[PDB]
Structure 1
Amino acid sequence: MKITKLETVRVAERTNLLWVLVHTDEGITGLGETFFGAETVETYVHEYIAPRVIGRDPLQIDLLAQDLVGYLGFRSSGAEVRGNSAFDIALWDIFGKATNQPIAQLLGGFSRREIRTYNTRADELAHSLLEDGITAMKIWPFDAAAEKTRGQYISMPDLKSALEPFEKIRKAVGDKMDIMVEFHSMWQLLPAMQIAKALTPYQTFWHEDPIKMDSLSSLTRYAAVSPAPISASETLGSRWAFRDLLETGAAGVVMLDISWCGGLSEARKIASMAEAWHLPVAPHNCTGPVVLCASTHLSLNAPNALVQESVRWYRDLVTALPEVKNGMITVPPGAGLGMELHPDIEKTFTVSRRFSDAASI
């Protein structure tokens, strides 16, 4: 079969989301998705990807991934890579539909049928999560302090204030809840280290993106004082960035976002490499439903998948969703992703579509 058209879809009600639909001459359409800079990525999909992939065999997934790597903008989570990643997800959806297999199977099998999930007044939230069988939560109480000083400094009183949610959670539920801390790369090295040390009494599970992930050797300074492993990083793209992270000797939980890192194609390889370092992987969500679903496929396959993040309107965008039951998530049934865009989407949302085909490229 051959790719005939690239279709991009946006909704005015959710401006960060972009869907990429890959049509074929066999009537099999693949669905992909990415998040942030939707208009920019959309332009890229039609300007750059379309003339390179119209007429091509979509089953040559590894080759197509290689053919879209840019002279510029590689090893990053920039617009080009986000576009490439969304396209790659759609190719896996096509491959699944063509073989009548779930993506998890095509990755090498369901190593598990479901996986533990985590979600993002802290003590009441903690109680509520536990009762629903969820035993991990991620919070980011230092972001407000970071914005005040652009991450160069935190006063001890502001630090103490930001520790209060941890004390509240521990007072409420004790050791029953894993607490992950997200820093959103907002801090410079010294205050990051200061905050890390201060978190020691609270038995935190991981410290995610404690500094900007642009010179990874700096992470060794952080690992030397951090009471929790470094979680890094949804902001990194390609297996080459992850080689660099692993070679620091400071890597902990390996985080990636399949729509930001080069697709399921790069993600599956990053995961197998992380396993060689005896480290786990945790694919990023809380963006769109397709990324949640495709990430769940990866998490059911990868032997070193630790947890699959999930959201505590998705139902109006797509035909089916991953299901969460007693704190565990699994994929919707069926070939490929196990979902498509909802038929009623243009009546619930304000939809814009753009097409490329043989005539337009």
Structure 2
Amino acid sequence: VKITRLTTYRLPPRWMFLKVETDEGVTGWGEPVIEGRARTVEAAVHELSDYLIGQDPSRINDLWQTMYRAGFYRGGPILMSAIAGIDQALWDIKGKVLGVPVYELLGGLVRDKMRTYSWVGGDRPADVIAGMKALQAGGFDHFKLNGCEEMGIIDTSRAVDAAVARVAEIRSAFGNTVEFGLDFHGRVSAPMAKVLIKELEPYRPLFIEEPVLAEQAETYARLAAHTHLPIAAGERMFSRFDFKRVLEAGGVSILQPDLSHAGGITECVKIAAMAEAYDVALAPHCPLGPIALAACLHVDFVSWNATLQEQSMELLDYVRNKADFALEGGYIRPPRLPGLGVDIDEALVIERSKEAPNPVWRHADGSVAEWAEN
């Protein structure tokens, strides 16, 4: 069995799918993070395919290590994202060849179902409430909201108060019936960080995600020593050494490794087991497509320390087996089909790739602002 071809497909949202074909006619699918540097990531995939074409896809460990360390410097945001997509597809192949879901190869189930939380948006606080009340009747009680009331940076007491007032209004609609985490995207100024966290404390969010962009992991420990609220982080980390430093410093209660960024299944299973050695909950980050979500589920269903799973609900378009990702009580069931358990509509992928379409945010003073999402 040998790898024959790699193809990438840019798709209408901020998605890229890749397809690994083999001489046995077994096809794997992976999904890299691209938001922002789509053409670079695409080039990385095709450069790394030199190490794959005519190799046995079953040696995932060998292929992972070759891509990561054998031909270049160790990967950062671009290469680790490319390696992640390829890794996902090799696992898809392996599970298809052996006729079982990926979690079965990785020791089998450690749980029967997995708790999920959803991201909820809205321009007004009333809009956010409405969306949460909709998903609540659907069966959810765990949510993730943007902490930022408006677009920009939290600079002033006035900006802190407005952000807290929004959170207050949202909390008063539910009390302790629902849980929500707040993601600030690192868009809080260093002087405001501690006062904001303190002002949110009465309204008790489940976590605070990325209050600031840390240069040293000591600042998360310094922030956490001030608050009862759990600090969540991990989406901007790729190396195992990024995670180890964050975990050894402490101050991060909830770790959020992205499957599509941190080197894939091969690597995220290791990050999960490293997280166990510290007193830290695991909540794998994935708001991407269906291939990457499925990849996350396989890590969730083998790692005992995984507690919550992020999903963005769209990703039902390119998948034929939509019912496998149905949610009851805010819980997802294990993938059912061999490999990653996603039946990809290859034809609908091919046709929509034929059409191919992020701005710079700046402060008032004109200075460039650190990257966030929409």
TM-score, normalization by structure 2: 0.86
Q: Identify the match of residue 136 of structure 2 among 111, 130, 135.
A: 130
- Local SS of the residue matching 2:301: helix
Q: How many residues align?
A: 343
Distance 1:346 1:140, change over 3 A: closer
In 1: Cα distance, 2:30 partner to 2:355 partner: 16
Partner AA of 1:22 in structure 2: V
1:60-82 Cα offsets, whole Å, 9 max, x none, are 112221111254363x3x11111
In 2: Cα distance, 1:156 partner to 1:282 partner: 31
The equivalent residue for 1:83 is 82
In 2: Cα distance, 1:88 partner to 1:41 partner: 14
Partner AA of 1:41 in structure 2: V
Distance 1:66 1:231, change over 3 A: same
Contact 1:5 1:23 in 2 (8 A): yes
The equivalent residue for 2:42 is 42
1:43-65 Cα offsets, whole Å, 9 max, x none, are 11112x01122122211112221
- Local SS of the residue matching 1:4: strand
Relative to structure 2, which stretch is displaced further, 204-213 or 323-332?
Answer: 323-332
Q: Identify the match of residue 32 of structure 1 among 17, 30, 33.
A: 30
Q: Could you list the runs of 5+ residues in structure 2 that have no partner in the other structure?
A: 120-126, 357-374
In 2: Cα distance, 1:220 partner to 1:282 partner: 19
1:252-267 correspondence to structure 2 within 5 Å: 252-267=253-268
* 2:47 paired with 1:65: no
1:85-136 Cα offsets, whole Å, 9 max, x none, are 1001111111111111101212221112221111112332332232222111
Relative to structure 2, which stretch is displaced further, 1-10 or 86-95?
Answer: 1-10
- Local SS of the residue matching 1:317: coil
* 2:55 paired with 1:56: yes
- Local SS of the residue matching 1:110: coil
In 1: Cα distance, 2:247 partner to 2:350 partner: 47
Partner AA of 2:25 in structure 1: G
* 2:332 paired with 1:329: yes
In 1: Cα distance, 2:350 partner to 2:22 partner: 26
- Local SS of the residue matching 2:176: helix
Indicate the percent of aligned positions where both proteins have the same amino acid: 31
Q: Could you list the runs of 5+ residues in structure 1 that have no partner in the other structure?
A: 354-361
- Local SS of the residue matching 1:349: helix
Shift of 1:252: 1.1
In 2: Cα distance, 1:330 partner to 1:200 partner: 33
In 1: Cα distance, 2:24 partner to 2:192 partner: 56
TM-score, normalization by structure 1: 0.89
Contact 2:290 2:342 in 1 (8 A): no
The equivalent residue for 1:144 is 150
In 1: Cα distance, 2:141 partner to 2:314 partner: 25
In 1: Cα distance, 2:40 partner to 2:133 partner: 41
Partner AA of 1:189 in structure 2: A
Distance 1:262 1:221, change over 3 A: same
Partner AA of 1:125 in structure 2: G
Partner AA of 2:41 in structure 1: V
The equivalent residue for 2:368 is none
In 1: Cα distance, 2:202 partner to 2:99 partner: 50
State the Cα RMSD in Å.
Answer: 2.0
Distance 1:245 1:136, change over 3 A: same
1:187-224 Cα offsets, whole Å, 9 max, x none, are 34332222111111111111111122443222222112
Shift of 1:349: 2.2
The equivalent residue for 1:241 is 242
Shift of 1:342: 0.6
Partner AA of 1:187 in structure 2: V
The equivalent residue for 1:154 is 155
Highest relative contact order (Cα 8 Å, sep 6+), 1 or 2?
A: 1
- Local SS of the residue matching 1:138: strand
In 2: Cα distance, 1:252 partner to 1:291 partner: 24
In 2: Cα distance, 1:176 partner to 1:234 partner: 28
Shift of 1:295: 0.9
The equivalent residue for 1:293 is 294
